[PDB]
Design a protein around this ligand. Structure first.
Ligand SMILES: Cc1ccnc(O)c1
Ligand SMILES: Cc1ccnc(O)c1
Ligand SMILES: Cc1ccnc(O)c1
Lengths: 281, 281, 281
């Protein structure tokens, strides 16, 4: 199923019939960082498998719902269960849920992820406001837009120089200052590793030389589809470890240690993003 | 349809029946840089869709013709409507038209493209004679030769160290000197970005560190198929912008600005390549 | 055919019925470096094409056998005819033979390859003990583990920091010292170029800047599948040329020169790996 105008429209039609919510904000939450979705008010939970033309996700299993409702007086739509390209999903499967968001009325997309630190000033537990990216799949002929262009959504050759909205970064930092946790908040360049193996010690050393501050396996595909169709983006990484320090000390990373960092920062990230949603212009 | 000896032969048979031209020069012209094709003498226009085993191009649409005839007393074949890998074409679809050129008798392939400047001495409107490349799709398992080797055309493991003929570069520069526009002509290393998103500001900064002079989304696949089967190559980029300066000044690139640069330099590029064809040994 | 638990089990069942050997060591030998397989004792040769669920290899042709028997009193299984990703094999086709090795009882995998030298201290004829890697296909969304995870074999997100066993490197070097050829033995970081074109002169210059010591077109996929399922690895490159010196002197590489280096070092590599097998803990 192609992520075209007709197919996205049929999914949006179903959603509008069931939910009655007209959202102008979308959210995609990272691994262990989804608590906010359980606090959406007057909410409606729609399993992906019920929505016409949504991608099949049963091989990977686990949760996959679209959730609509209100936060801070604002109308939102959330993806509960993100699609990752290391699972084997195609370009068309990644793009269709974002283009449905567009047809539903979304103008701002807020994204979180868990990532590895490269810049030496980053520690486990820090947040990074993403200000640009290095898209290794894109350079290597696996960009999320490879294929026919869907002209109704956007141009054949997008410019990404303003993909990460500057005023949204400034609002996120302002709220951290108001609540006295700005000492945790950095800005940086995100490198997209297709995955699913963690960056090796020598890949980490290479990324340091190339000007990368953070590395992870998500986010850049969704940012590109959003920018292509005119949706503004804020993207924030939670740092699980510093991979350069780990290479110097021969220390390993693993999914269990990552998720313990997520649990440590989940409630603060929930409070931060609730206020960001409330304060959006 | 595989780009094998049998299938390429059937396409060449059709072409020979219709055109009567036996070319020894091939040309592939970049976006907005095709005016020379409209001035081929005693010419024959063959739509791709009529040629057995040529790739289907109707999803992308727009022009797609093979044009045979004479320029400067020399017999040539031109591709009018280039195939780009960001459209989703396979390795086999890109390679078959070049291998048909080989079977028709082509010994020299002349290529132009529109590209972004990385080296600080490059301005909008400059030309770059390409002397080597950095093939990010190739390093990343998307080389145009991934698949079975077609032994009749070339070896399993090609050497690319002489892919860009030195004497052809010298002839191009000599002609620019004769017509007093050598101040526009540089040489440089071409980085292949699969695309279709323009290089981001941080990708541009990375490419500067890695020794790239120019970046674009074409040309390297055709060069590799030509080198594999023994065809000599001249490749010239027209620079639309300097992406490093643009990142420093927060200025955007877009397809409209690119095509205005193409129109500005089209007639000079036409005159240059007409003389190159006339003067080839 | 997916490289899952059921399918790997059916291949292992066939092999156990035919060979009676229960190996705990596996070997994969590089191009022109397979002489040791012809000296396996009380051996059993099983063509890939006879084994249920093994990948089809007739388009590429040439030898493809699994060979079981004894070396130095140890029980081994060898792949005679390696599968390379530049031939077009899928992730699932590369992984299934390694996962069959796991089910048969393999705990240690020994690998050799032919590679190009980047570090300036490497000469034609030198050996490199691989201590880490830079996986350009992996960064670019062509990692061998892209797809559903097969949970019975290993975790969704592997850590590769100990993929190249340190004690096995130390044993290999000790044996070289005992036989007075340690002057040929280096250690280094291996860059994976998907291929099949040799690294270009400008790609070589880039790899030097990025901390790569050696470059080649194999080995990293098998290492990752082995590490994922808990198999220890020793990987050794034989250097055919120095690509940085060749770029400075405008000298070419080709398959014929490569194989002459292989013949020059084949008998020493055979003796070295026989002793390594004998001495494994
Ligand atoms: C959380 C973690 C840290 C390391 N690298 C990633 O891709 C993810
Ligand atoms: C003409 C243009 C300039 C920027 N980058 C490209 O790929 C193309
Ligand atoms: C043997 C050789 C030397 C150059 N590069 C490779 O991939 C292989």
């Amino acid at each position: 199923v192609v992520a075209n105008y007709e197919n996205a429209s049929m999914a949006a039609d179903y959603i509008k019939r069931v939910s009655n919510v007209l959202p102008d904000i979308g959210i995609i939450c990272g691994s262990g960082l989804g608590k906010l979705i359980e606090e959406i008010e007057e909410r409606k939970v729609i399993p992906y498998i019920n929505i016409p033309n949504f991608p099949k996700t049963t091989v990977a299993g686990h949760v996959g719902n679209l959730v609509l409702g209100s936060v801070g007086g604002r109308k939102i739509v959330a993806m509960q269960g993100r699609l990752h390209m290391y699972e084997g999903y195609s370009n068309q499967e990644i793009a269709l849920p974002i283009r449905v968001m567009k047809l539903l009325g979304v103008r701002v997309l807020l994204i979180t992820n868990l990532a590895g630190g490269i810049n030496r000033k980053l520690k486990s537990g820090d947040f990074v406001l993403i200000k640009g990216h290095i898209n290794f799949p894109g350079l290597g002929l696996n960009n999320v837009l490879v294929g026919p262009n869907q002209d109704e959504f956007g141009p054949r050759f997008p410019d990404l120089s303003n993909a990460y909205d500057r005023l949204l970064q400034q609002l996120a930092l302002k709220i951290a200052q108001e609540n006295d946790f700005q000492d945790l908040v950095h800005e940086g360049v995100y490198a997209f590793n297709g995955g699913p193996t963690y960056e090796s010690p020598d890949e980490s050393n290479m990324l340091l030389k190339l000007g990368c501050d953070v590395v992870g396996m998500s986010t850049v595909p969704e940012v590109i589809i959003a920018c292509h169709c005119g949706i503004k983006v804020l993207a924030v990484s939670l740092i699980a470890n510093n991979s350069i320090l780990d290479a110097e000390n021969d220390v390993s990373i693993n999914h269990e240690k990552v998720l313990a960092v997520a649990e440590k920062r989940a409630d603060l990230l929930q409070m931060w993003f609730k206020e960001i949603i409330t304060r959006l212009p």
